[PDB]
Write a structure and sequence with these properties.
The structure is a homodimer.
Chain A (H helix, E strand, L loop, with lengths): L13 E5 L10 H13 L3 E4 L14 H13 L3 E6 L15 H6 L3 E4 L3 H12 L3 E3 L13 H11 L5 E2 L5 E2 L14 E2 L4 E4 L2 E10 H4 L14 E6 L6 H11 L10 E5 L9 H9 L9 E5 L10 E3 L2 E5 L6 E3 L3
Parallel strand pairs in A: 1-2, 1-3, 3-4, 4-5, 10-11, 11-12, 12-13
Antiparallel strand pairs in A: 5-14, 6-16, 7-8, 9-13, 10-15, 15-16
């Protein structure tokens, strides 16, 4: 294919941490050490961008500063992977100011989720570098239930073979950054098949309302021949999820969408099967394509890691319904 | 750029429900609201499907489109008021007969989610539409007086006018408790950035306007005065991101000016964050910008044209003047 797969991570590889959305100032100091020790135990050298600790009234840093840390990360040949500190709202500010030629010449892993969707997508569409929706640096500071996250991080970035995106045994919706000890783990009922079928396609997705931010710009990926992986957080309610989806499915290529896989909603959103069904059902672009929900990604725990611009196959009759092929 | 003829005593107004069902309004508020337009000398009629309510508190696309088409189809209908806002008027856009519309210019007025409908209608037909009072707006027992004037200023007459800061403003659910309101001295407008500007007026609800992006409904932003606004669900960082995304749309390099509606209190906007937000927007550099205008999810709210025109003089007493409308 055309899409560049960056080199996979190996022991002794340097990993650079950058804060393209919210400053690492948001994290407690000791949570940082938890993440550092996990990534180091996994075989990696952790290093931090010059400006990560800088923080402004939006709890972020300046544009000038974020771009510089990004450019340094891509430019430094010892850096085999870039992880973002944590999500936020503002990574889209950076899109015009990036040197895509630089990036396109220095392909390497870039990984994070939610707001990072904007950044990882723009990079994909401008350079054709396959990027990743998956753990942040802070994701590794979560004390309990981290197994799935690491396994999946590894499936995706430590080895080449295709892999099933497998249901976790238990999931939670917790603010675990405030309270690590009192977790509420819920037996996982599994993927729900909303509409049956078999399809394969380019993976596009991450955070729904973040991906909408790319609309009308040169960074918006075409939607034809894609499996959409979509997700959204507690701020969403079913009716806003629906407008955002409707709007997304009005973008170029929307008529050739191959399938859809939806991340578990946070409990606050109160998304019943009935409403989800009604939302899917009234979308023209989703007619007679496979649609699955309840997947492990989005804003609940745990989260898988999947490529943006890699490929997937959906099959609703199989035991493992989601297969990551090119990653 | 066409223009709907103004309401004249006796004219038929049609009430449609493009987002949420009238079934979310207290029945007696529909009665209240219906007395007012009637005292204002108008005959009030309803679309067949306004009472339909689904699980989203809205109704089927087909229903809503049908009401829209009979409202334009009907030469005796002189004005169309949306029942109220919601989230879903954007589902309707691909199904409208814009030809039928272009050939029946008339007044369409609503605010909030109705921004999607009014904007599409303007950018497809060049028919000027309005961000202004709902039908439901007139069910408000008290503090209704500015709503009336502004409305009247816009849709009952042909002259220019200005946009008075209101004497008092509020953030209250007056449809739940009409009697216990907390009104307020208006500190009035705020100059974020100085200057003078005239051009085309664009779009009410920010996050709603975002949904048009990437589609044939998105109006070009060249030579435009942005009147933006968003409700309590928005926080400064989302408003900032939504703004950032809008200012990346075609023609944003040529924006002439910006007016920003009073925020709801739960948003928790501050002078400092508001300012940090403007400064960091490239497209906004060395043009005029004003906070605290009266529209959006506060009360009272003005009614201005989408596609009509405005002059902004930061050097004056009345800084916001609506010309064409």
């Amino acid at each position: 294919s055309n899409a560049m797969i960056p080199a996979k991570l190996k022991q002794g590889d340097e990993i650079r941490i950058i804060a393209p959305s919210r400053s690492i100032g948001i994290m407690a100091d000791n949570q940082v050490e938890i993440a550092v020790n996990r990534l180091t135990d996994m075989g990696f050298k952790v290093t931090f961008g010059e400006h990560v600790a800088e923080m402004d009234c939006m709890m972020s840093s300046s544009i000038r500063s974020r771009v510089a840390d990004i450019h340094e990360a891509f430019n430094d040949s010892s850096v085999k992977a870039i992880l973002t500190v944590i999500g936020g709202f503002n990574s889209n500010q950076l899109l015009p100011y990036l040197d895509y030629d630089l990036i396109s010449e220095n392909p390497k892993i870039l990984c994070g989720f939610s707001d990072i969707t904007a950044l990882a997508t723009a990079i994909y569409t401008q350079t054709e570098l396959i990027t990743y929706s998956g753990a942040h640096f802070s994701s590794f500071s979560m004390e309990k239930g981290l197994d799935y996250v690491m396994e999946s991080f590894s499936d995706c970035l430590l080895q080449k073979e295709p892999f099933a995106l497998k249901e976790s045994a238990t999931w939670s919706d917790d603010e675990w950054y405030l309270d690590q000890e009192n977790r509420n783990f819920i037996p996982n009922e599994g993927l729900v098949v909303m509409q049956p079928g078999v399809a394969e396609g380019i993976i596009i997705g991450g955070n729904l309302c973040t991906l909408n931010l790319l609309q009308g710009t040169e960074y918006m990926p075409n939607l034809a021949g894609t499996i959409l992986f979509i997700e959204d957080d507690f701020m969403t309610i079913p009716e806003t999820f629906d407008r955002d989806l409707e709007s997304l499915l009005s973008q170029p290529g929307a008529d050739e969408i191959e399938g859809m896989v939806i991340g578990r909603f946070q409990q606050k959103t109160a998304m019943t099967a009935e409403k989800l069904a009604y939302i899917i059902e009234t979308k023209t672009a989703l007619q007679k394509i496979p649609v699955i929900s309840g997947a492990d990604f989005g804003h609940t725990q745990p989260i898988a890691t999947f490529p943006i611009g890699g490929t997937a196959r959906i099959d609703t009759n199989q035991t493992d319904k989601i297969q990551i092929i090119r990653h």
